[PDB]
Amino acid sequence: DKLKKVLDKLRLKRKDISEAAETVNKVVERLLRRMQKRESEFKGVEQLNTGSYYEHVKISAPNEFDVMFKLEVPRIELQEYYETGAFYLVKFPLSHFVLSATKMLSKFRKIIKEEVKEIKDIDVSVEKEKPGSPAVTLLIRNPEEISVDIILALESKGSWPISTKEGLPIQGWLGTKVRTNLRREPFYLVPKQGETWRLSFSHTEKYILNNHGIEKTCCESSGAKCCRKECLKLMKYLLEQLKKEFQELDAFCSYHVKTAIFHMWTQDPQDSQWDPRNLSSCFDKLLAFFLECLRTEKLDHYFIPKFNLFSQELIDRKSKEFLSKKIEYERNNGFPIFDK
Amino acid sequence: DKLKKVLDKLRLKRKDISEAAETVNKVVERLLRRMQKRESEFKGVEQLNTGSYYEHVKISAPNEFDVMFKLEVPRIELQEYYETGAFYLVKFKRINPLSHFLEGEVLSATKMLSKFRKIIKEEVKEIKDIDVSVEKEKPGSPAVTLLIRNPEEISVDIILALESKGSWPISTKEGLPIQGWLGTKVRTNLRREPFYLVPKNAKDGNSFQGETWRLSFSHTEKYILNNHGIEKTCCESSGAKCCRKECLKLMKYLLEQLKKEFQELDAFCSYHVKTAIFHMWTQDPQDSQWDPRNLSSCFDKLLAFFLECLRTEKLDHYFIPKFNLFSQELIDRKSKEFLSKKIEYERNNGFPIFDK
DNA sequence: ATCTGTACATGTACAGAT
DNA sequence: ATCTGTACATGTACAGAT
DNA sequence: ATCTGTACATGTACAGAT
DNA sequence: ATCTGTACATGTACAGAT
Ligand SMILES: Nc1ncnc2c1ncn2[C@@H]1O[C@H](COP(=O)(O)OP(=O)(O)OP(=O)(O)O)[C@@H](O)[C@H]1O
Ligand SMILES: Nc1ncnc2c1ncn2[C@@H]1O[C@H](COP(=O)(O)OP(=O)(O)OP(=O)(O)O)[C@@H](O)[C@H]1O
Ligand SMILES: [Mn+2]
Ligand SMILES: [Mn+2]
Ligand SMILES: [Mn+2]
Ligand SMILES: [Mn+2]
Ligand SMILES: [Zn+2]
Ligand SMILES: [Zn+2]
């Protein structure tokens, strides 16, 4: 009852989706065309849409869109950075940039910013660079505000790096044939010290969000609806509302929630453990899983098992205890935060 | 248990598989390479292994392989032959290495098959390290069949096929009803794969005889056989074993044994049995209706179903709903009744034909 | 010199063998 | 249970062609 | 190489039926 | 309340034309 009503509030409106999408598509098409057909270092960059809007787990409003501009590279040589699992040096047009990530991002960002100056028909600016973040972020102002993250990424077509050998443990859930095929796809590197890139599996996570049942018919027109995505949306909402209220939660992001629920989906593969009539206890067992991650300070990258997203190197113990207390409070009081 | 022991007799032996597959691949690789030579009209033909051996339902011995030599054919327009749903005339838009077989835009199937056969016969002649010959042509067969004496006898059907990448012919819009079983995403992807036309090659005396092609979906059936569960992990190393393929084997065997004994059953073929079970798998989508512990009553329900198809004279092509493989036009009532009595007899007497 | 159809190289599900 | 041969999907090398 | 056309997936929206 | 059926909307894969 309660959680149904929250999900109705979170649902995007069809009209709001139509307006944001056609503005976003205008800017993205024009930027993609400024690459390639202008003999840049990024000729041949191809588009791939990623993230919550395209996985259909976006909540509240269509106000944030993620796009990769992926660029195939002749067979590069990778070297793992100091055993971090997820970060790598890259070695061997592009000779203008060891393939320095910051050097290549800056030219990328220099092109985007120039093309945005010549957009006289949409209110669109380029957000001040956030260091380390791999994105070039656009603030579009429809009558409403929309973020777009243009993520530069190298596409490599060989075996996945060995730090992922034990990753993606879908064998008992989506199965071995799905896993083998997923791992036959390319992998991607995005910018993160100034020469380091980071692995990306946004394409693999997109497939999983839209192929998320042990049953091939899960959530199709001739199958049964499950509540996996609704739990992702609810857990996403709880963290969004808590990040607004508390600056102490600045080090948490939605990817932390995404990763935890990939683990829950793997720990509980059956589609009937995610029946829509059991939406409450499903969401509760996700809260308890997420609190177990905080207490043990352990949340492994789903594709890179040794990379702990909750290591003290990245998040202070106090931040996790703070979030642990705030989540425990919303849990034991009917989620008052969902009504504001 | 009794059915468990039949499957062990039906189980292929890896030693036999190894020697059969070594010879068969040597011959096919050499025929395929010959097709790419000179001004051969079949340049660019590609190989696609189909049928029971590659679905892992081949029984008793590895002694019959099917392989498709498919040739992609671009601007192609199709005329359904007399509302049959499965048979087509193939016409060409622009007036081409295949022009040698045209007859005013209409592409002759038996002209193409003859040139295919002649080339195959010639390459078989120059194979000196293997005892292989080319079977006398069989009417209604799209295939050029090789007999190998590897000491043991081995049949190989080289099937000539046209490959069209366009959307499937509308006679199939209602076919492949896998929405409640393998689902709609699977169905949409499957129907984005090409479709194939093989020569009908009948000598019936009917009009358009040598210019009639038949639709083929061996490629879609290979996928289904090897991805047969509602659950993605069905029969995988971290999932539950089902008995779907084991039922198909037991039924294939019932028909093979009876066909071996009774000339009356010449009109029947293993595809009837494959088709019947695709309907049974659609009817019973859940993996739990194909539990290994209920192999007996699973095999029994597929029998009851096959009997109803023989008696009511209705077994729809899985992909072309309006094509009835058991119409009276194709098989006599007398032939269907005879098989119905024989299946009944085995069913209610402990299957004594398994012990032969 | 580069290009490219052909064939080797790699990895793993499937199921037979032990 | 683990070891293992065949089939097949996709990446990559390179002899011969340009 | 680039771009449109097509089909049907994933959604939202709502009335009528349960 | 939910379930079913139809309208409406965008996203995505790829054939075929240029
Ligand atoms: N720390 C990270 N490590 C790896 N991939 C990440 C990380 N952060 C983001 N991504 C990838 O980028 C995508 C876009 O991330 P973003 O921050 O927009 O969140 P999201 O999943 O799209 O959801 P939302 O925007 O609604 O919070 C993610 O879905 C994920 O694939
Ligand atoms: N009458 C038919 N109509 C349509 N497709 C057919 C027909 N006969 C055969 N096929 C196709 O050709 C394939 C090869 O036929 P074949 O007679 O070898 O049987 P099979 O399914 O391979 O089994 P087995 O040879 O072990 O009896 C079949 O799997 C099917 O895809
Ligand atoms: Mn997003
Ligand atoms: Mn983002
Ligand atoms: Mn066969
Ligand atoms: Mn055959
Ligand atoms: Zn679902
Ligand atoms: Zn199975």
Side-chain angles (χ1 to χ4, degrees):
Chain A
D1 321 314
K2 176 48 169 292
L3 296 178
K4 260 88 95 175
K5 280 324 318 188
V6 170
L7 287 168
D8 283 275
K9 167 209 216 93
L10 296 182
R11 173 160 310 114
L12 310 187
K13 275 132 211 147
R14 192 175 39 175
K15 172 205 169 174
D16 295 339
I17 291 161
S18 200
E19 319 201 340
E22 75 190 28
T23 292
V24 162
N25 285 341
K26 276 169 192 181
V27 188
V28 174
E29 185 224 277
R30 178 161 191 197
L31 289 164
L32 187 59
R33 154 211 80 79
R34 165 57 188 90
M35 311 272 151
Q36 66 229 11
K37 278 201 187 301
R38 257 276 311 191
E39 299 69 44
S40 48
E41 291 87 335
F42 308 92
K43 204 173 131 208
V45 98
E46 308 163 313
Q47 177 186 357
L48 163 45
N49 300 324
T50 58
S52 59
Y53 172 89
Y54 298 105
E55 310 159 323
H56 317 98
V57 283
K58 186 77 183 69
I59 60 175
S60 292
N63 58 8
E64 213 266 350
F65 294 74
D66 304 287
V67 188
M68 314 216 330
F69 282 21
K70 56 205 187 52
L71 187 47
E72 333 182 30
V73 305
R75 308 195 322 287
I76 66 198
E77 159 160 26
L78 288 210
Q79 174 171 178
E80 188 203 11
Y81 183 101
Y82 287 0
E83 289 288 321
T84 83
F87 298 93
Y88 288 92
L89 273 310
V90 169
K91 216 35 165 150
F92 283 5
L94 305 185
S95 67
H96 290 304
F97 323 120
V98 151
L99 195 53
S100 161
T102 50
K103 253 211 256 194
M104 184 160 196
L105 180 51
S106 319
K107 178 71 173 304
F108 196 69
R109 169 187 206 78
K110 192 209 202 126
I111 296 165
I112 309 275
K113 215 155 39 172
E114 289 186 355
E115 199 54 47
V116 167
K117 284 160 191 302
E118 336 279 8
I119 293 174
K120 316 86 64 183
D121 79 316
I122 311 167
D123 192 0
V124 49
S125 37
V126 174
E127 179 179 79
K128 183 197 220 251
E129 173 151 31
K130 275 151 173 254
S133 153
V136 180
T137 302
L138 311 175
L139 174 38
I140 302 172
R141 283 194 212 79
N142 260 354
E144 314 78 26
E145 313 213 330
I146 315 176
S147 274
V148 190
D149 287 326
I150 318 299
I151 291 112
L152 186 266
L154 324 165
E155 184 177 77
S156 159
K157 261 169 39 206
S159 263
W160 288 12
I162 37 180
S163 74
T164 80
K165 233 207 190 315
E166 298 321 321
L168 186 50
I170 58 167
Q171 288 90 344
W173 166 36
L174 307 181
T176 59
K177 294 200 279 308
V178 166
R179 193 184 181 272
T180 288
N181 289 337
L182 281 183
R183 282 174 55 91
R184 291 209 268 237
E185 293 292 348
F187 66 93
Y188 302 88
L189 292 165
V190 301
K192 172 251 212 202
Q193 103 145 77
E195 339 308 328
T196 61
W197 304 64
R198 191 207 82 208
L199 287 161
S200 183
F201 301 101
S202 287
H203 65 318
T204 312
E205 302 162 14
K206 196 174 176 217
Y207 172 89
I208 290 165
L209 259 297
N210 307 128
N211 297 270
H212 61 241
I214 194 169
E215 301 218 334
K216 289 153 189 179
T217 55
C218 186
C219 281
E220 292 186 342
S221 61
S222 263
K225 192 82 188 20
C226 80
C227 68
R228 279 184 188 95
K229 289 198 215 205
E230 297 70 9
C231 288
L232 181 56
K233 288 167 165 207
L234 286 175
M235 190 69 252
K236 284 181 70 165
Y237 191 49
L238 180 64
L239 184 64
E240 265 186 38
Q241 290 301 61
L242 284 162
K243 276 181 69 56
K244 280 193 193 148
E245 253 302 290
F246 303 104
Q247 255 182 246
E248 307 82 319
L249 308 179
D250 271 351
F252 298 105
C253 58
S254 69
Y255 199 64
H256 289 125
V257 168
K258 203 188 204 194
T259 300
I261 209 189
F262 275 16
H263 288 296
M264 264 290 268
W265 288 341
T266 322
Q267 151 167 338
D268 292 349
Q270 264 325 127
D271 302 340
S272 57
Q273 323 203 235
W274 302 85
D275 195 284
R277 291 161 294 170
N278 298 114
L279 167 64
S280 276
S281 71
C282 288
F283 180 52
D284 204 61
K285 59 172 193 191
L286 174 68
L287 291 159
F289 181 102
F290 197 88
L291 291 148
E292 253 284 292
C293 288
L294 292 168
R295 151 184 100 90
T296 46
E297 287 171 84
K298 191 174 166 56
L299 177 67
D300 305 308
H301 200 287
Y302 195 63
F303 304 76
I304 305 151
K306 72 173 156 178
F307 184 75
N308 184 12
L309 304 183
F310 278 10
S311 88
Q312 296 186 169
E313 277 146 74
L314 295 319
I315 294 161
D316 259 301
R317 201 210 258 159
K318 33 205 153 186
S319 307
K320 305 172 194 117
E321 318 178 305
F322 188 95
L323 178 60
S324 211
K325 287 160 189 143
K326 289 299 168 211
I327 271 155
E328 274 276 34
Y329 175 77
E330 303 299 326
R331 193 172 181 210
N332 311 324
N333 302 283
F335 306 92
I337 196 148
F338 280 172
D339 321 314
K340 55 175 269 263
Chain B
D1 169 86
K2 142 98 137 165
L3 294 178
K4 277 264 198 312
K5 290 184 278 141
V6 179
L7 296 163
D8 299 313
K9 188 218 322 202
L10 296 182
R11 180 154 293 116
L12 300 198
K13 308 212 275 327
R14 171 171 284 183
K15 201 215 154 93
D16 300 331
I17 292 163
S18 214
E19 302 165 327
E22 261 169 12
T23 307
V24 157
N25 299 350
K26 229 205 183 277
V27 179
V28 174
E29 272 147 25
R30 185 162 199 218
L31 297 170
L32 196 66
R33 191 193 328 114
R34 165 56 166 100
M35 296 283 159
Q36 325 296 329
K37 289 177 108 323
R38 337 168 188 175
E39 290 86 300
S40 149
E41 306 97 337
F42 305 95
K43 178 70 154 294
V45 86
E46 309 177 285
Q47 171 186 347
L48 201 186
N49 292 333
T50 47
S52 55
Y53 172 84
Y54 298 99
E55 304 154 339
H56 310 99
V57 288
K58 185 66 175 87
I59 61 172
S60 311
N63 60 14
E64 207 269 347
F65 303 71
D66 316 285
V67 36
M68 206 162 280
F69 276 18
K70 75 213 183 47
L71 179 71
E72 179 188 346
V73 160
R75 284 214 185 171
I76 166 177
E77 142 188 349
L78 251 62
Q79 165 105 81
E80 191 195 21
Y81 167 88
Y82 280 160
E83 287 137 90
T84 62
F87 304 106
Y88 292 83
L89 277 35
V90 172
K91 316 225 227 194
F92 272 97
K93 302 310 300 167
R94 82 89 189 167
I95 206 66
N96 209 342
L98 296 192
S99 77
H100 301 297
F101 320 115
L102 279 205
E103 304 200 346
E105 263 174 24
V106 164
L107 176 67
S108 164
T110 65
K111 259 150 179 211
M112 219 174 148
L113 195 38
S114 277
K115 187 52 173 297
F116 192 68
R117 188 172 200 91
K118 183 190 185 294
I119 291 169
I120 291 194
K121 274 158 127 90
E122 279 168 18
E123 197 50 57
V124 162
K125 203 194 48 66
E126 331 278 21
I127 292 166
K128 290 85 155 196
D129 59 308
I130 298 165
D131 180 6
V132 54
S133 83
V134 177
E135 216 187 54
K136 170 181 231 271
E137 191 190 308
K138 202 91 56 193
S141 175
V144 179
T145 301
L146 305 184
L147 305 314
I148 285 144
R149 313 234 219 198
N150 215 31
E152 49 271 346
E153 274 143 49
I154 307 191
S155 264
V156 176
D157 293 323
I158 316 302
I159 298 125
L160 169 70
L162 311 196
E163 171 180 272
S164 184
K165 297 177 177 209
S167 71
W168 286 14
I170 67 139
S171 78
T172 77
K173 216 196 72 175
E174 301 324 321
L176 190 66
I178 60 170
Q179 287 90 346
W181 168 36
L182 314 183
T184 55
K185 289 193 278 309
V186 156
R187 188 175 185 265
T188 285
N189 300 349
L190 283 177
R191 289 178 47 84
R192 282 157 167 184
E193 277 296 281
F195 69 91
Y196 300 95
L197 301 145
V198 305
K200 153 175 193 237
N201 190 41
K203 200 60 57 82
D204 41 5
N206 271 85
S207 309
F208 295 99
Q209 230 186 257
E211 300 78 37
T212 289
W213 300 76
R214 184 204 90 220
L215 280 165
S216 156
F217 296 99
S218 294
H219 66 308
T220 308
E221 309 169 5
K222 183 180 171 205
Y223 174 87
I224 283 160
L225 258 298
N226 298 323
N227 309 260
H228 56 254
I230 191 155
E231 297 208 338
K232 283 158 195 185
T233 56
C234 188
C235 283
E236 286 194 347
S237 64
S238 267
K241 242 295 195 164
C242 87
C243 75
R244 274 185 187 94
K245 291 202 206 183
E246 294 65 11
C247 273
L248 176 49
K249 289 183 180 201
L250 289 165
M251 181 89 233
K252 284 165 61 70
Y253 193 44
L254 183 57
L255 187 55
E256 273 188 29
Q257 288 297 73
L258 289 164
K259 269 184 69 57
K260 223 172 67 199
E261 247 193 296
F262 299 102
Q263 214 219 49
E264 289 87 341
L265 303 175
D266 280 339
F268 297 104
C269 73
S270 68
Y271 192 70
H272 297 132
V273 155
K274 196 182 193 186
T275 299
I277 214 178
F278 281 17
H279 287 292
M280 269 291 93
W281 292 339
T282 304
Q283 249 187 259
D284 296 352
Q286 299 308 313
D287 298 340
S288 51
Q289 297 150 96
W290 306 86
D291 195 301
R293 169 202 36 245
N294 310 125
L295 175 64
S296 268
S297 60
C298 290
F299 179 55
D300 191 72
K301 75 184 162 169
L302 163 70
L303 280 202
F305 181 67
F306 202 78
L307 276 182
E308 156 85 340
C309 296
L310 291 166
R311 296 244 196 227
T312 61
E313 270 196 324
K314 220 207 148 173
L315 175 62
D316 300 328
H317 198 298
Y318 197 59
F319 296 79
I320 308 151
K322 78 190 180 175
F323 190 80
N324 179 16
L325 319 178
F326 281 1
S327 80
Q328 218 253 326
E329 323 281 302
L330 287 156
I331 310 182
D332 285 347
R333 172 95 68 194
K334 99 153 95 170
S335 295
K336 278 167 288 218
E337 205 27 53
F338 181 97
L339 179 55
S340 286
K341 291 197 203 302
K342 287 286 183 203
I343 291 182
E344 262 165 20
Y345 175 77
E346 300 297 323
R347 186 176 184 215
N348 320 89
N349 286 271
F351 295 91
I353 212 169
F354 283 162
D355 325 318
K356 300 192 183 26

